[PDB]
Amino acid sequence: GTSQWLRKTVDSAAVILFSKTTCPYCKKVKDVLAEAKIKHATIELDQLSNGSAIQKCLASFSKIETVPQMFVRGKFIGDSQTVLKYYSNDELAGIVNESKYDYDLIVIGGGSGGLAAGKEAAKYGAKTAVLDYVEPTPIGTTWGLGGTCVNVGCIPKKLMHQAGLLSHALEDAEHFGWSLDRSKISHNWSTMVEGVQSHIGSLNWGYKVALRDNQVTYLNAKGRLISPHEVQITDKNQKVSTITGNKIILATGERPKYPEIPGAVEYGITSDDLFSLPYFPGKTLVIGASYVALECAGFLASLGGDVTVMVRSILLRGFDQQMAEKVGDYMENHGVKFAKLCVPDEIKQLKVVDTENNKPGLLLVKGHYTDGKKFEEEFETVIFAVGREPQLSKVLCETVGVKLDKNGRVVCTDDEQTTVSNVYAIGDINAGKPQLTPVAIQAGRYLARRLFAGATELTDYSNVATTVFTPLEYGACGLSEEDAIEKYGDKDIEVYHSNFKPLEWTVAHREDNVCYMKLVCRKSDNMRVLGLHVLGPNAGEITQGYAVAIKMGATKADFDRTIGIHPTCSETFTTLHVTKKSGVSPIV
Amino acid sequence: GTSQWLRKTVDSAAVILFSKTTCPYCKKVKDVLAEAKIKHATIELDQLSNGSAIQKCLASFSKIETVPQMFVRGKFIGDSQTVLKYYSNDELAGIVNESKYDYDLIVIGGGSGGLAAGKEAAKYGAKTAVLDYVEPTPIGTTWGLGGTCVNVGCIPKKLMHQAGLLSHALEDAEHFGWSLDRSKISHNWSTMVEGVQSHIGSLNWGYKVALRDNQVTYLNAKGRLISPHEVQITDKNQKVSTITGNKIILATGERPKYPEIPGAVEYGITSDDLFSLPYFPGKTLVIGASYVALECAGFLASLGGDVTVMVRSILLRGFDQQMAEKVGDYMENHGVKFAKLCVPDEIKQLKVVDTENNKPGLLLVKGHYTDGKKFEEEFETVIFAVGREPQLSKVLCETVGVKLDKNGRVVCTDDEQTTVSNVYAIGDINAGKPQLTPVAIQAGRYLARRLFAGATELTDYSNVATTVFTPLEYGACGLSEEDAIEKYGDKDIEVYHSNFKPLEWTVAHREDNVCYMKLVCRKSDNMRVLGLHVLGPNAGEITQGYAVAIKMGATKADFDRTIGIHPTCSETFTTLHVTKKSGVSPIV
Ligand SMILES: Cc1cc2nc3c(=O)[nH]c(=O)nc-3n(C[C@H](O)[C@H](O)[C@H](O)COP(=O)(O)OP(=O)(O)OC[C@H]3O[C@@H](n4cnc5c(N)ncnc54)[C@H](O)[C@@H]3O)c2cc1C
């Protein structure tokens, strides 16, 4: 019970003190540790409804019953007088660096969650080190500390989204009385990349400073787990060496995948190259239909690019497919060409990349349709976006004993633990979890606090809100319509749906019936909202708030009784009434 | 009990039928009424957990116990065979127009809630009429059906907001690689008003069509309640006449207020004139500090106007005052001049409005500071925005017996009822209620359904979300910080707060620490979120979703455990930690 919790907190904490806020004698020892710059976690026993039980239970270790007690790395250090004896006699910081290992904590992977974990760990006294290498792309693209979001993901994509919507700011700017001529402005790619790279720069720097000011040894080195507590590192100078840690965290994320065909790796790029590209790609083939694939097709189009997407099977597999279809129909209606049910066979080269003039090469793409017909067409740039995958063999010697799944990802209990007890994994290599940057951040912080601070809080992986930043934005929460039938049966599912139109689009003369939204509720369980969907502007802002109501289990009636803000788009959700079952049309 | 509910539903319904979905004999009578185009409400007894009790209780009226039973205006009409006897013998529509009054329902006021009520009422068979007059402003400004939001409120203001933000689209458009020169574009006022007026036109028309297709007699006439069931109307031709109604609904909203000083009414305008102004106002005095006053100062500035606001007392009285201050400091830092603690004495005229050249007059404003000092300065346009007020004496003869409060508003029970039983009020003349367009809409629909359909649902007036559409937008939900102390005491209040910066502002080189947000929770009641506040872009979208969680009573831990969407602004709310109490700084 409580019994058993507290033996784990004492064992795993680097430095921990039990106390009471109403106590001079706890206060006087805190003061000694602030001054000697000794960092620690602290449990105020007068603040848990468990504190009496623990205060007596503590004695199993300390053979005493009173506050304060200080432990260092599982070992009882002493009460008040003995601590200040260790201090007055100049013996403190030598016992507080007593460790069977170099580091309390070694984090392989300096990305989203990996930095999140390290930062929170050193807060509570754990001697923490953090390791990052960026494997260069086939053409040599490489970036700075921070991981996939910062450098080749959510941050550079979304700014590049923003530059695309500004293409319709200027269109609309005319009808609202501004005296520009949209039809005579042009977008410049280099100037756009230059700023996006300037901001990424300042993120790279800010993380290095953050780590340095928390006492975290950053180690620009490729790291491998040979034994449970032995991590082996290799630097830029190719020097080898082993470091040791009590607890080891695996947070190395993923990297892009390539179709096995002639020409791919040679003459094609991916997401990692695109965001610091030194020239505008020009005519572009986007192979793939993931969110990454449509989003990148999206801003390329919006910045005057000539864009084509080659769709193997469906658009956005695993999302609601009505919204898929709607998402893509906006993009077709606004430029982006789709090659439907189609698949590459080989890339040949017609012109080499000209790295003096900032100009692309030129390509011949050869592929086929599923019905038989051929596919042949020329393109200046070919971007593959067909999936991401981890590469744990480079990182995790199969001999240590961590159970990978069939995909390549790690099997973890609901506290992120691997089949070796001193190792854990978070981020994209956790199996069957949401592969999202704030999800990683959520895991790495809550896990840190349980290893080095006695926290019990788990991460809730369910019902995590998402948004795709396509020309029209799509934001989502919960099950998609088709699944929620496949689980409770059509009869048990009612759906409320509606078109709409942002007030801003009225004067701009935009479309009457493209925006859409729907609630998928369960009849039998009090009409409980099972999933929520919206396509229109600012879907991220519109969605995120409803992620809370839903995590508390909201029903339709909660939506009905709550009052809207006007004029907004989001206020349509409070007044829905037309059901799919009814057959009444959802227009305006 | 149930007993008593059902005598009210039978009494007030114009035409109502009790039935069961599993019934051929109910079906066969519905078919007869669809064909004769007879409209009605319908209670399926096999769908309430009260249905057995009612089915027997019904007999108090019908002396029978079986389905279906049809009543018209409180009178039992017959079972199946007798209804189709009335029909085969060509006697139906004559009994279904049996009424002790011309209309079931007379709605004085053709605005937000007033139209909302009328529309929902005629759905369930009630012979409904709707009345609207627009009292011309002192200079003669007048508009079409729809009310204050449509014509001189939320719709024309917010589009005019939109034209203001597009002023910073074009600024930012440069840094994202677009080849315009922001510094050489100018805004044209006439072209902007022209479009906003085009959209309002199409709203005016759409309401007239809506009313006409629901069978609602629209009566462009000024209406007055002389007796409880007698309403007297006067048209454009000044013709008098009386109409009679069973139930009477008061929904005439409000109109603008004027300071009692020389020159005001003569040489000044208000909100009603501004939105169809035929010239750009130029140099403008904004007297007032309501939301209306800052919002209008806001877009005038953003469209290059030279703008000044004269603040009697505080900014935005009744909102959080930290957010007030922050709101205004953005506007000062972005142009808008504030004359602090200051008050007009008189307006004199230097030039008359020149209505050929589309040019304003010119004014001399004379006023004083509260400390003594004088105020004297010239201005091309003076906009008064010092409060709205109803004028019920024009509408409601004091002799009938409806209890007004001290302000001028009506006293209603929590079902919108006036001290006369057949009369009700909704919208801005309901006392002590939120004066918001979707609030009016919410009252007018739920009230309709209870008068003519047996509904029991009330409107929940508490915790209604708001947003001010100032240059920086401020959206709000719940108590403001100062109140939530004044009710539970400082010790019981914890506050979580944080700065932030939209990812979009990064490349645009906008400000590091202007955006702000905070959660005001109650320690003792499980840290329950009492109010929520945000200042940044898209506050309306950002807020509205959290209006639901809060209506279900969300606590901080609900925010902590829910996962964010990234990059958005809204995702800061899921990761708050710094408390005001702690004193840790909220920057970035
Ligand atoms: C184009 C794109 C856009 C995206 N947009 C969004 C979005 O808008 N929102 C969202 O929530 N998610 C988005 N994602 C997903 C998001 O990036 C991931 O959830 C996130 O990056 C996962 O973080 P992580 O901490 O698991 O690992 P990563 O961020 O991938 O970081 C792990 C780091 O460890 C390094 N590493 C690997 N092996 C070693 C080794 N042996 N030694 C040392 N270092 C090593 C890697 O190079 C990397 O820098 C996007 C992804 C892509 C590709």
Ligand SMILES: Cc1cc2nc3c(=O)[nH]c(=O)nc-3n(C[C@H](O)[C@H](O)[C@H](O)COP(=O)(O)OP(=O)(O)OC[C@H]3O[C@@H](n4cnc5c(N)ncnc54)[C@H](O)[C@@H]3O)c2cc1C
């Ligand atoms: C500038 C401005 C901006 C606003 N912006 C917002 C916003 O963004 N969001 C929001 O929620 N609220 C906003 N409001 C408030 C919103 O307009 C009100 O809540 C709403 O208009 C109230 O509607 P109502 O149905 O009570 O009456 P009204 O909309 O005022 O309609 C009543 C109608 O009845 C007419 N009438 C009066 N007397 C008679 C009579 N004797 N005979 C016939 N007809 C008569 C009136 O002329 C009017 O047309 C704004 C208000 C203003 C002034």
Ligand SMILES: N#Cc1cccc2c3c([nH]c12)CCCC3
């Ligand atoms: N299409 C599109 C699109 C997608 C998202 C946001 C916007 C905005 C405009 N167009 C948008 C024009 C001005 C208002 C903001």
Ligand SMILES: N#Cc1cccc2c3c([nH]c12)CCCC3
């Ligand atoms: N200041 C300001 C302001 C207020 C509300 C929204 C916005 C946006 C910009 N400025 C904004 C620039 C482009 C992104 C959208």
